């Protein structure tokens, strides 16, 4: 029976979840699952290669719609060796029938979170991985975009040591204006200025995150974990020591400034005691990325030029975006019904026969 033969070719199920990505994508296999999306590898029968596919089911939640739309708009506009690309986007032909969105990407082999569960990296690999993180970040920042959620699990790696940044659902254009109150699986990579509810978040929040990641590559343990922001801030102070007076009155939030001032003194702990086997140039750059004052924190192009990365630094081959993005959306107040229409519009170009 033709119908019986059609149902055999129907949607595959992975770990109990439906993945309706035929006819183009077949032979699905589980990769991973974030807080929002379910990721499988699949065979692309048109381009004849395996790909990664992330399924999101967002339309009942304003916050899921924001993440879906932001990731799609930003990654479709980015093109960089160290940033994951979107190859295709699968969804239903009518807005009425669209309930899931599948984002199709180049397939990577693992992520740095998984890799650090299984092995201690040599200094040479840490150096090259850190270079690539910063090289991709240089491009992101050149577009005037903040990633805002860098962490080991969204640094993808392949079998030839190539690294790509992914997971752009929180990425935003920088602007002087409830930041990062939405749920995330881990807050351990967030800059202290976010925890203190200072107002003017800048590119420096991403550099902090990269400093946390470097620390974790050096010891295979998170450097500033904690149950609550209070606990994380106490771990930051327990290592960096108490902030200076100059650093304090650079904080906009009078309330947070007051609490820190009440805290008992903490002396800075030297990095070589936390990381005794680590390269001293890696610890110098680490120190400059984990500086409390965001105004003093090293910038991405300065970090690329640091002596630790000198064998990879090449400004002639560290490309930037053609134009910095402008903020003309303010989609953080749009209702999820409006967000769904925009997602539908943004994904129309991938529909068969467009």
């Amino acid at each position: 029976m033709a119908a019986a033969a059609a149902a055999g070719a129907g949607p595959e199920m992975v770990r109990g979840q439906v993945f309706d990505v035929g006819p183009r994508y077949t032979n699905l296999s589980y990769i991973g699952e974030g807080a929002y999306g379910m990721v499988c590898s699949a065979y692309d029968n048109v381009n004849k290669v395996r790909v990664a596919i992330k399924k999101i089911s967002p339309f009942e939640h304003q916050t899921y719609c924001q993440r879906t739309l932001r990731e799609i708009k930003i990654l479709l506009r980015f093109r960089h060796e160290n940033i994951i690309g979107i190859n295709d986007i699968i969804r239903a032909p009518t807005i009425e029938q669209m309930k899931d969105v599948y984002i199709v990407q180049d397939l990577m082999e693992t992520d740095l979170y998984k890799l650090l569960k299984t092995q201690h990296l040599s200094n040479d690999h840490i150096c090259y991985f850190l270079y690539q993180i910063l090289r991709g970040l240089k491009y992101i920042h050149s577009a005037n975009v903040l990633h805002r959620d860098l962490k080991p699990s969204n640094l993808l790696l392949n079998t030839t040591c190539d690294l790509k940044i992914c997971d752009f659902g929180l990425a935003r254009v920088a602007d002087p204006d409830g930041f990062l109150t939405e749920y995330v699986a881990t807050r351990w990579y967030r800059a202290p200025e976010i925890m203190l509810n200072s107002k003017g978040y800048t590119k420096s929040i991403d550099i902090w995150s990269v400093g946390c990641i470097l620390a974790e590559m050096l010891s295979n343990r998170p450097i500033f974990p904690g149950k609550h922001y209070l606990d994380q801030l106490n771990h930051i102070l327990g290592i960096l020591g108490s902030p200076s007076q100059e650093d304090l009155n650079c904080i906009i939030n009078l309330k947070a400034r007051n609490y820190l001032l009440s805290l008992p003194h903490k002396n800075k702990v030297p990095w070589n005691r936390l990381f005794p086997n680590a390269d001293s140039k890696a610890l110098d750059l680490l120190d400059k990325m984990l500086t409390f004052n965001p105004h003093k924190r090293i910038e991405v192009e300065q970090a690329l030029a640091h002596p630790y990365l000198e064998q990879y630094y090449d400004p002639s081959d560290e490309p930037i975006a053609e134009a910095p993005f402008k903020f003309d959306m303010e989609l953080d107040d749009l209702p999820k019904e409006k967000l769904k229409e925009l997602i539908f519009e943004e994904t129309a170009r991938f529909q068969p026969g467009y």
Partner: peptide
Amino acid sequence: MQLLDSSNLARRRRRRR
């Protein structure tokens, strides 16, 4: 995963100048 010699970007950096 089993992890500088085979990466394309690393080759460009080795062979600059």
